[PDB]
A paper describes a structure:
[name] is the most potent microtubule depolymerase in the Kinesin-13 family. The C terminus of [name] binds to the motor domain. The C terminus of [name] induces motor domain dimerization. The CT domain reduces the affinity of [name] to microtubules.
resolution of 3 Å with good stereochemical parameters. complex consists of two motors bound to one CT domain. the interface between two motor domains. (A) Dimeric interface of [name] motors (cyan and green). a salt bridge interaction in presence of the CT domain. repositioned in chain B in the presence of the CT domain. group of Ser715 is in close proximity to His246 and Glu244. cause steric hindrance and prevent the CT domain-motor domain association. critical for stabilizing the binding of the CT domain to the motor domain. dimerization site, distinct from the major dimerization domain.
Author numbering:
A (entry chain P): 710 to 716
B (entry chain A): 228 to 359, 371 to 385, 394 to 423, 429 to 456, 469 to 497, 513 to 587
C (entry chain B): 229 to 297, 299 to 359, 370 to 425, 428 to 456, 466 to 497, 513 to 533, 537 to 587
Write the structure that this text describes.
């Protein structure tokens, strides 16, 4: 999409 | 706006997913801990349109994108990667920072061994702020939460080989063969007393600064916690002291009996600290992500890696 | 080596990189660039050739390139970001799900698809593409669509065509290794090509194997075209290319032009230069054309001189 900061 | 670099940094980070460090993570416990902490770009730094230049794709990995130039003068990037026990960024509080660096060490001094923590880097990076509330105080109540023994507090600075105790208003001291007499050790009954010792020591009107937690039972030392805020790694005699540190720390993964001194005033008084079958240490290399302070930033890291040794 | 082995080893000791799982969302990309690290070979290993490709994130690769100054030791851990980065644990289907699978969806709307592997000899290309093959899995997935009760209108006649281009001298691997002719009107179009219609995915595999059996394999590209036809009318064409070894002088200008022609696909093409750019010119025009590049590499220290160019090529194909 992109891209995503998460974990 | 240099502009073209900020273009190249963002067409990098676009394609990049990052899995940061969280409180969900386990608290690791090593011989020598090497961490790094990037501070956020301040207003005055932002107001000049300074590109952030450092990323943290994970809990440990750290990526720096440095602006290089050809002989063409073709603007370039060279993406250098670095690993550490815990790399953490803007979002990281001190509560985060204490938990992964100093927090395991409080238990260490109550054992009978002795622990020391350094924040090291460039001027205006985040050394004083990290340790100064700060890591000193954060250990204190957790030092005081753990319960017959009494606790003593030391605070002093090292400049030009001289040694000041801020506790007494500018009270010069001497170091000898290891023992520093005139050692100001105030007894505290809880964080209350200690918190008052830090700010008073800090209030005093290019220098190392050391804070100590000490334990005695019969009146005999049990555990020593030494938290140092080093000078800027950029008269140039400071270069030597920090250089010695690397060697002093290194002899602690060799479980070594022998260490070098004299050529460094800082070490001498911190010197019990680099020996024993129970001596742990953490190192905090803080950096300024402001692109036009990148050379200082790299130097701050090339010092800290492989000093896992 | 020894030394450069412990600096790396020390680095990958605190590394906590995560591995991309199949569950990971398939992205839909107009121009996808991925990198495939190849597992270490027992021969490369036997010589204790050292592993030097750190792939910590689904979207990220590293190369601890070994150079030295006083000769006091250092390591330059270099980062390259990508849409995808495959490790030595990534299966073929694993690489399929994120490169060629979404592209199958594109040909069924008359769209044009073209997908490359680009790396040195002994990097993974001609493996990693072609039952093992991205070729084979393309068909298998293609036939599945034709069966679905959603495209069964457009009564299509699956075809096949596997040819090889070598120094301007192209060759159709569908005959007795016969040669071909290429022209274009005042558009592009081949001559003599024999579109092989298949109707079993097994058909394609035994259709490919000819070119396999026929075809150093490294001075020439292998180009495989899947074409959908409804009633003899062309729908969409999918080109899968096992490129010539990227490491003989015309070859570099075949990749000069290719790289140039993937540049303008993003900007919505200097095709007339090289023969590879001529045959697949269609798949580089319009808003209907998607491409996927698999720059594949070698994990060994000796390669690092030459697999840092393949990485440098790829980084200039995302813009
Ligand atoms: N979390 C934070 N991120 C960024 N800047 C901060 C943060 N906390 C405090 N600061 C401010 O940054 C300033 C830098 O001072 P200091 O930390 O002494 O620089 P250095 O320690 O590098 O010499 C401090 O006055 C402090 O108020
Ligand atoms: N991901 C992989 N897993 C296992 N083996 C591989 C992988 N990639 C390549 N190989 C092996 O490496 C060898 C060389 O690869 P190949 O693609 O045939 O040559 P080229 O790189 O010139 O196309 C092949 O025999 C193949 O078996
Ligand atoms: Mg900015
Ligand atoms: Mg300061
Ligand atoms: Mg790894
Ligand atoms: Mg090959």
């Amino acid at each position: 999409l992109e891209e995503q900061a998460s974990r | 706006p240099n502009w073209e670099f900020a273009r190249m940094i963002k067409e990098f980070r676009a394609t990049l997913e990052c899995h940061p460090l969280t409180m969900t993570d386990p608290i690791e416990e090593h011989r020598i801990c090497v961490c790094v902490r990037k501070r956020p770009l301040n207003k005055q730094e932002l107001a000049k349109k300074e590109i952030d230049v450092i990323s943290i794709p994970s809990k440990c990995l750290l990526l720096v994108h440095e602006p290089k130039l050809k002989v063409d003068l073709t603007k370039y990037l060279e993406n250098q990667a670095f690993c550490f026990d815990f790399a953490f960024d803007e979002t990281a509080s001190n509560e985060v920072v204490y938990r992964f660096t100093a927090r395991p060490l409080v238990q260490t001094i109550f054992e009978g061994g002795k622990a020391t923590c350094f924040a090291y880097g460039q001027t205006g990076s985040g050394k004083t702020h990290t340790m100064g509330k700060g890591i000193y105080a954060m250990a204190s109540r957790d030092v005081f939460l753990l319960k017959g023994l009494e606790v003593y507090v030391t605070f002093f600075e090292i400049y030009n080989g001289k040694l000041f105790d801020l506790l007494n208003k500018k009270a010069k001291l001497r170091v000898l063969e290891v023992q520093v007499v005139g050692l100001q050790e105030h007894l505290v009954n809880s964080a209350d007393d200690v918190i008052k010792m830090i700010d008073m020591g800090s209030a005093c009107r290019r220098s190392h600064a050391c804070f100590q937690i000490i334990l005695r039972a019969k009146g005999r030392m049990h555990g020593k916690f030494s938290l140092v805020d080093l000078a800027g790694n950029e008269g140039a005699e400071i270069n030597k002291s920090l250089l010695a540190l690397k060697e002093c720390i290194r002899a602690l993964g060799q479980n070594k009996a022998h260490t070098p001194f004299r050529e460094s005033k800082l070490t001498q008084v911190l010197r019990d600290s680099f020996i024993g079958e129970n001596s742990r240490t953490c190192m905090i290399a803080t950096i300024s992500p402001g692109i036009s302070s990148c050379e200082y930033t790299l130097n701050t890291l090339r010092y800290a890696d492989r000093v896992k040794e």
